[PDB]
Amino acid sequence: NLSYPITPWRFKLSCMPPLSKTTFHCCFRSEQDRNCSLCADNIEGKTFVSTVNSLVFQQIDANWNIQCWLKGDLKLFICYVESLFKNLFRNYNYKVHLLYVLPEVLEDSPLVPQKGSFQMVHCNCSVHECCECLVPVPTAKLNDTLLMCLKITSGGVIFQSPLMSVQPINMVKPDPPLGLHMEITDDGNLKISWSSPPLVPFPLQYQVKYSENSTTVIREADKIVSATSLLVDSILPGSSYEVQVRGKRLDGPGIWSDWSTPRVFTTQ
């Protein structure tokens, strides 16, 4: 048990009050419902909060938007923890104790993950408090659900996140497409194609923003093709063809890849 689905992939989180020993539980923020879960790693996570602790918490409030996707190579699972508020004068310095467990699927009855089964991997944080991590994931047990509950001790203030349940194979955000080239074919059609990442196991469909614009008269004609190669028909001379391609997994949920550098072909 202790599984909570998350929608969409990016979830907004903020910390609520339940000093160094005290751990403060942080919950997801949504306009409809609020979900709070306690990580099985530490039962003692819920601690008594003093009046001075509450005053400190209301004086300085830390809220973090967390978006995490697995690499296309499946070797490491990145996990970005970005704060809503960034202050130049004061920057929080902390060590993030990320704990992850991905146990095998049990055929009969649901089993809550055991205490201590979570693996320990430290995180790397930038000056904008955007903490990116590298979480290894075994390939055999990759197909099973992954449970997340982060521990962030920020200057004597410990942060805890609710348990998320999501399949990591649909959590992959692919690398932006590269190697795209343009050349008019002998058939009479512009050839623009891209190579799928070999490390990505699942088939990838692509969101293409192709625009047929002319300098004299500006018109927009967007076309999206799921195939690896795009053969746009009825090419007109003396027009600009700005094309940019991003890809994501076809079946089931998927995270769109970041848009690459736009490239435009201007015909004579």
Position 1, amino acid: N
228-258 CB burial, b ≥16 within 10 A, e <16: bebebeeeeeebebebbbbbbbeeeebbebe
- CA dist 14 → 91, 171, 243 (Å): 18, 22, 39
Resolution in A: 3.9
**How many residues make up the chain in this entry?**
268
Segment holding 214, helix H or strand E: none
Q: What angle do CA 139, 143, 149 make, to 5 degrees?
A: 95
78-88 CB burial, b ≥16 within 10 A, e <16: ebbbbbeeeee
- Integer Cα distance of 7 and 13 in angstroms: 13
- Give break positions in the chain: residue before each, C–N beyond 2.5 Å: 18
- Concatenated DSSP letters for 193-205? E----TT--S-EE
Alpha carbons within 13 A on the beta-carbon side of 111: 13
- Integer Cα distance of 53 and 70 in angstroms: 36
Residue 219: what are its φ and ψ, rounded to 5°? -135, 145
Q: Which of 76, 117, 122 is nearest to 97 (CA)?
A: 122
- Strand pairing category for 157-160 and 164-166: unpaired
Q: How far is CA 81 from the centre of its chain?
A: 10
Q: Evaluate whether 167 touches 141 at the Cβ level (below 8 Å).
A: no
Q: Evaluate whether 150 touches 160 at the Cβ level (below 8 Å).
A: yes
